[PDB]
Amino acid sequence: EQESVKEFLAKAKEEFLKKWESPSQNTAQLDHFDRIKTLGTGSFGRVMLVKHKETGNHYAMKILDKQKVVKLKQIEHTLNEKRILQAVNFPFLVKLEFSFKDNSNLYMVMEYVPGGEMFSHLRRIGRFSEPHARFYAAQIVLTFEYLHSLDLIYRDLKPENLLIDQQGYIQVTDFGFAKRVKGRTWTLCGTPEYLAPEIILSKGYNKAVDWWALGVLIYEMAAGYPPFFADQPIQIYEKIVSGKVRFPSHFSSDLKDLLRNLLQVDLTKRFGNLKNGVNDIKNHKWFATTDWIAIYQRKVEAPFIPKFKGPGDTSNFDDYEEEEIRVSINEKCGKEFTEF
Numbered sequence: 001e002q003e004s005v006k007e008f009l010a011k012a013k014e015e016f017l018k019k020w021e022s023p024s025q026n027t028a029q030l031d032h033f034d035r036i037k038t039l040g041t042g043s044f045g046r047v048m049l050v051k052h053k054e055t056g057n058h059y060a061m062k063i064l065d066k067q068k069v070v071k072l073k074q075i076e077h078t079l080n081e082k083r084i085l086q087a088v089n090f091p092f093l094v095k096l097e098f099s100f101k102d103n104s105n106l107y108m109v110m111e112y113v114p115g116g117e118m119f120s121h122l123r124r125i126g127r128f129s130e131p132h133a134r135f136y137a138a139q140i141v142l143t144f145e146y147l148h149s150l151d152l153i154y155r156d157l158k159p160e161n162l163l164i165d166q167q168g169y170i171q172v173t174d175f176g177f178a179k180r181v182k183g184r185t186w187t188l189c190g191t192p193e194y195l196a197p198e199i200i201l202s203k204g205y206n207k208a209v210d211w212w213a214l215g216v217l218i219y220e221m222a223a224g225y226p227p228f229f230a231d232q233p234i235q236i237y238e239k240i241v242s243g244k245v246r247f248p249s250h251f252s253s254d255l256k257d258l259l260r261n262l263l264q265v266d267l268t269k270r271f272g273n274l275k276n277g278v279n280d281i282k283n284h285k286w287f288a289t290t291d292w293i294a295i296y297q298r299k300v301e302a303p304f305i306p307k308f309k310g311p312g313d314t315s316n317f318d319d320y321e322e323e324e325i326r327v328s329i330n331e332k333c334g335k336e337f338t339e340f
């Protein structure tokens with residue numbers, strides 16, 4: 001990195017630490033918003049499109065049921081997610097605008113990104129050209145350079161978590177597994193196709209798992225399917241730990257070389273985790289045409305501009321059963337979520 005990048009990252013870490021040490025809390029409430037539509041769902045939570053009543057602005061509100069968070073043993077992960085999101089700031093990360101809790105739920109009110117998930121766009125077109133995959137990959141490389149310099153591991157890279165904005169740039173969402181780690185960590189988390197071998201083998205692992213996941217993402221963007229695909233998790237895990245991969249013949253030689261270095265089973269040999277860190281990736285011949293500054297400054301014309309009618313359009317997200325959001329008259333799990 002040149003000194004200007006070093007100085008940028010030093011400032012970025014100072015600004016992160018100030019918010020990390022003194023987190024914002026309780027900056028909105030539920031009856032300040034109208035409920036519009038469910039944008040996505042899960043085991044302990046739900047993401048809703050909402051409209052702020054006074055300003056008219058739209059947001060994506062993630063709602064977690066405290067009792068379900070406790071039962072699924074996600075308390076620490078949920079506290080990590082909110083504490084990290086209120087402290088980070090980067091062009092390719094979805095912004096947290098407000099957060100609050102009530103007797104029943106935890107709420108994170110995020111910017112709403114109307115272009116949909118990368119996953120939908122990838123599945124609909126089949127695969128991305130190498131330049132198109134490279135444009136998105138470059139944004140992930142910069143985002144992981146930022147997060148890793150703050151000692152954060154992201155741990156949930158997959159196409160569903162990359163939203164496409166109006167300008168065709170990626171914004172990364174879902175910090176549910178992100179953690180501040182200055183050395184190793186041990187939790188089994190992540191989607192099967194994206195897990196590094198050291199996670200599957202129950203080892204203490206580090207930020208190298210995010211570089212592995214980038215290799216899986218680039219492969220899947222350029223092929224249309226992930227490199228260790230199989231019908232059941234145990235078979236996926238066997239392929240991941242094997243040390244072999246098959247590349248489509250249409251992949252360029254430079255793409256294959258980059259992917260063999262990201263998908264290196266030995267974490268001590270994996271690109272992103274060597275002495276030169278991220279620069280082995282940024283200087284790789286597959287990225288030779290990438291202007292890293294221009295990508296950061298959002299000056300590159302994107303390959304694809306999502307079609308949508310306005311900031312309240314939900315057409316790029318799919319339809320889910322609409323369930324209500326209840327708030328008990330009795331406080332649940334107050335102690336567990338005191339810091340939220």
Ligand SMILES: CCNC(=O)NC[C@H]1COCc2nc3cc(F)ccc3n21
Binds near residue numbers: 030049061
């Ligand atoms: C039928 C439409 N109902 C609302 O607009 N209700 C507004 C408030 C209070 O009532 C329960 C409730 N659940 C919500 C979920 C949201 F995502 C946003 C606001 C929500 N509210």
